Amino acid sequence: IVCHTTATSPISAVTCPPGENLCYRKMWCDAFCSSRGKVVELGCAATCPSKKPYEEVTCCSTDKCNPHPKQRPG
């Protein structure tokens, strides 16, 4: 098994040891906070880590379906 990532990778694929069960979407920004709206740092989850004052952290519950909008000429 495994999950997707986004972080310091261009992209990569890992999940955490058997405890986590799904993959998540940490919405925030870069330290550069570039003109692309929201950075999303995908990875391993057991529950959906969402906050309220900034961190949207939604999920996907099945294989590969983790990500957001990205792969478009924009």
Partner: peptide
């Protein structure tokens, strides 16, 4: 170089 919500490539994202 980033995985924002507008691109995935380190050319379009940043």
């Amino acid at each position: 170089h980033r995985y924002y919500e507008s691109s995935l490539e380190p050319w379009y994202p940043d």
